[PDB]
Design a protein around this ligand. Structure first.
Ligand SMILES: Nc1ncnc2c1ncn2[C@@H]1O[C@H](COP(=O)(O)OP(=O)(O)OP(=O)(O)O)[C@@H](O)[C@H]1O
Ligand SMILES: [Mg+2]
Length: 379
């Protein structure tokens, strides 16, 4: 037949994995990345998806779509939608109560339902899998946050159908993470697991109680507007200030300068999770001025201190609601690309009085990993 795949669809990135010969392989895309941006772009001549889309965002703000996960399954009159709209550089219109994204493709203006944008990303993932597997992918298990209602889940299932994917099942992201680590095996005991998920733009904390294979979400908390992007922003402002100090030039207005500076920062941030310092080299940032500088892990940590620290409040809240003390949680798994940050790992352990963190599986691949296993058994 055909190997069912596991797909995680995140607000900023997506990932696809497959279970074969007892091992789960996370499939790398055309650029060789193990995760693909959830970006879709429309130009005069083409429809760009993934890395190709994100790589040209500075040029096409109005026709480059993202955050479709924040729209999916919702209405236009939805307070959330009404708030989010204020920050997207693309158009969201009302179509009989449902929101739609309006872009210009090949001179003509077009509109898409949130699920159609997601189906585009889903198609890229399916494509990546097939290119690797050398076979056509039909069956799949897609992940969704635990707090998604039936409409949001419906729309995700739909986005899968559009892409020609037979969605075997939609499972929660935290549950997929648990399965990745094997925290679902029956041990004739009640296990309390805390899933700490800090991705690109969202922060989710979920306390699961696993009784004989059966998962039970006891509490959830977090911030839908706190993620790795907020950390990048802090770097940007910092460097803008420095440029204005060394050159007496404010580049805030120049959207190209800022958007290129941001890309440089996000990159330096990743290397800061291994090295203690990274350099920023950008040619002709503003006018013909080349911006050559660098940051240390120490400085980076200072810039996001309050943010990193504030991460513990949602954790305290989740425990409180679940009616558990720090000592009652058996396993803590790290999920989301942002958890690779050292200071975040330290901060969490200290809170759990030195308890060991589960983090051998790349945190941004954990959900995909778990869905792959789940997909495997489902076939
Ligand atoms: N080494 C690293 N250090 C810090 N952040 C990293 C590292 N590697 C990846 N990231 C960050 O992880 C984020 C992507 O996380 P992930 O791939 O889990 O996102 P996601 O599921 O789309 O997230 P969400 O749904 O929360 O937005 C980006 O902010 C990226 O900068
Ligand atoms: Mg994620």
């Amino acid at each position: 037949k055909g190997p069912a795949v596991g797909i995680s669809l995140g607000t900023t990135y997506s990932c696809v994995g497959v279970f074969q010969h007892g091992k789960v392989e996370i499939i790398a895309n055309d650029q060789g990345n193990r995760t693909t941006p959830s970006y879709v772009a429309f130009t005069d001549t083409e429809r760009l998806i993934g890395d190709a889309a994100k790589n040209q965002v500075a040029m096409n703000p109005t026709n480059t779509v993202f955050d479709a996960k924040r729209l999916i399954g919702r209405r236009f009159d939805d307070a959330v939608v009404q708030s989010d709209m204020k920050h997207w550089p693309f158009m969201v219109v009302n179509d009989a109560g449902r929101p739609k994204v309006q872009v210009e493709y090949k001179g003509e203006t077009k509109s898409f339902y949130p699920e159609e944008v997601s189906s585009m990303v889903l198609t890229k993932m399916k494509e990546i899998a097939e290119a690797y597997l050398g076979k056509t992918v039909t069956n799949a298990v897609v992940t969704v946050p635990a707090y998604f209602n039936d409409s949001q889940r419906q729309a995700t299932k739909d986005a899968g159908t559009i892409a020609g994917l037979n969605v075997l099942r939609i499972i929660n992201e935290p549950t997929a993470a648990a399965i990745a680590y094997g925290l679902d095996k029956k041990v004739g005991a009640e296990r309390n697991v805390l899933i700490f998920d800090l991705g690109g733009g969202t922060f989710d904390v979920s306390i699961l109680t696993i009784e004989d294979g059966i998962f039970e979400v006891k509490s959830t908390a977090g911030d839908t507007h706190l993620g790795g992007e907020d950390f990048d922003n802090r770097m940007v402002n910092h460097f803008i200030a420095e440029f204005k100090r060394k050159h007496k030039k404010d580049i805030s207005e120049n959207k190209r300068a800022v958007r290129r500076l941001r890309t440089a920062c996000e990159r330096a941030k990743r290397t800061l999770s291994s090295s203690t310092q990274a350099s920023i080299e950008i040619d002709s940032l503003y006018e013909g001025i080349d911006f050559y500088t660098s940051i240390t892990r120490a400085r980076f940590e200072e810039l996001n201190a309050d943010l990193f620290r504030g991460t513990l409040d949602p954790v305290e809240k989740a425990l409180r609601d679940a009616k558990l003390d720090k000592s009652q949680i058996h396993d803590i798994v790290l999920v989301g690309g942002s958890t690779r940050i050292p200071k975040i790992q330290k901060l969490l352990q200290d809170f759990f009085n030195g308890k060991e963190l589960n983090k051998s599986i790349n945190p941004d691949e954990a959900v995909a990993y778990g869905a792959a296993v789940q997909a495997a058994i489902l076939s």
